[PDB]
Amino acid sequence: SAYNEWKKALFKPADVILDPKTANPILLVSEDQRSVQRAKEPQDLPDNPERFNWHYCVLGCESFISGRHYWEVEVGDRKEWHIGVCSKNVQRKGWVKMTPENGFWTMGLTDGNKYRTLTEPRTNLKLPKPPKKVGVFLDYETGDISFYNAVDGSHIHTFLDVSFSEALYPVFRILTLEPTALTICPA
């Protein structure tokens, strides 16, 4: 596919590994640091400043301050998940809504079949086919964050022309307790 042939020509493949120091205590990061699951109850962890203590999210280890980058995430048959990027300086303690205004550029799935962007207000997406693998693409210079179905190259959503100033981290959120994890594809 053109998607597969060209993605590495235009975007640097990011090798994203999850940062356990950032993960909400109810999340489990796999040994290989590519996958995240939820626990039934929060685990006993320090409340170090880097850790999300309310939002059920986790960041990649590395942030971006320039250039074009991409990574792919196997969402599989999960009924709930949200992914994208956030600013380094987002509020990690307590709650502010995950929205672009609050430094989050994310989309995902809720309730099995409701795809949406995490905007204010949330906006529904109409997807021809349910994606199993999602490519997340960042062009720092153009301010574009795009999401594609990684299997067939179809477009899912683009946040256009954002005026980035802060470093951007891959972010991942899961709320539900389900058999399938959320898993980053290695570069």
Architecture of domain 1-187: Sandwich (2.60)
Report resolution (Å) to 1 decimal. 1.7
| CB proximity list for 131: less than 8 A, separation 6 or greater | 75, 149, 150, 151, 156
| CB proximity list for 32: less than 8 A, separation 6 or greater | none
8 A C-beta contact, residue 111 and residue 127: no
| Structure determined by | X-ray
Cα 180 to chain centroid, rounded:
16
How far apart, in whole angstroms, are the C-alpha atoms of residue 174 and residue 46? 20
- Please give the full DSSP string across the chain, using - where no structure is assigned: -HHHHHHHHHSEE----B-GGGS-TTEEE-TTSSEEEE-SS-------TTS-SSS-EEEBS--BSSSEEEEEEE-TT-S-EEEEEEETTS--SS----SGGGTEEEEEEETTTEEEE--SS-EE---SS--SEEEEEEETTTTEEEEEETTT--EEEEE-S----S-EEEEEE--S--SS-EEEPP-
